[PDB]
Swiss-Prot record:
This is Large ribosomal subunit protein uL1. It comes from the Bacteria. It comes from Thermus thermophilus. GO terms for biological process: regulation of translation; translation. Pfam families: Ribosomal_L1. One of its GO terms (cellular component) is large ribosomal subunit. One of its GO terms (molecular function) is rRNA binding. InterPro entries: Ribosom_uL1_bac-type, Ribosomal_uL1, Ribosomal_uL1-like, Ribosomal_uL1/biogenesis, Ribosomal_uL1_3-a/b-sand, Ribosomal_uL1_CS. Belongs to the universal ribosomal protein uL1 family. The lineage of its organism: Bacteria, Thermotogati, Deinococcota, Deinococci, Thermales. Keywords: Repressor, Ribonucleoprotein, Ribosomal protein, RNA-binding, rRNA-binding, Translation regulation, tRNA-binding.
Length: 134
C-alpha cells in the first residue's frame, strides 16, 4: 500500500548508488518490527543454459558465516549479506566480499560484463541499484 510506496520516494528512479550510499539507504528502508535481512541480487552475464558456465560456491563474509550461492536459471543470483540492524560500514564489507566472490567465478578467458545488474534490498523494502565498482 502507501506504507511500501513511501519508501520508493526515497529511492532515486534512475540513479546508480555506490555501495556506501546503499548501506545507509537500505537501513532507512526497514521497519523495527522484525529485523529485515539485507540481500544482493546480481544478474550474471553467463548463459543459464550452458553445461559448463555455471556458478556455485561459498564465501566467508567478514561479518558472519559463509553463504551458498548458485545461478538460478534466470541468470540471476541472490545472497544474504547481513541484517538491517548491522552497522552501515559492516554491510558494505559483506556486499563487496560477495561481489568479489562472484567476480572470481567469471568465465575463463571470456571478456565482457560479467555483472550486468546489481541490486541491494531488504525482504520488506524497495530495491536499490548499486555500482559494484565502488
Amino acid at each position: 500500500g502507501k506504507r511500501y510506496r513511501a519508501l520508493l520516494e526515497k529511492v532515486d528512479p534512475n540513479k546508480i548508488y555506490t555501495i556506501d550510499e546503499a548501506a545507509h539507504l537500505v537501513k532507512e528502508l526497514a521497519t523495527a518490527k522484525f529485523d529485515e535481512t539485507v540481500e544482493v541480487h546480481a544478474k550474471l552475464g553467463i548463459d543459464p543454459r550452458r553445461s559448463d558456465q555455471n556458478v556455485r560456491g561459498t564465501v566467508s563474509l567478514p561479518h558472519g558465516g559463509r553463504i551458498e550461492f548458485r545461478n538460478d536459471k534466470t541468470g540471476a543470483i541472490h545472497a544474504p549479506v547481513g541484517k538491517a540492524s548491522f552497522p552501515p560500514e559492516k554491510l558494505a564489507d559483506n556486499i563487496r566480499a560477495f561481489i568479489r566472490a562472484l567476480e572470481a567465478h567469471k568465465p575463463e578467458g571470456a571478456k565482457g560484463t560479467f555483472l550486468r545488474s546489481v541490486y541491494v534490498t531488504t525482504t520488506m523494502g524497495p530495491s536499490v541499484r548499486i555500482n559494484p565498482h565502488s
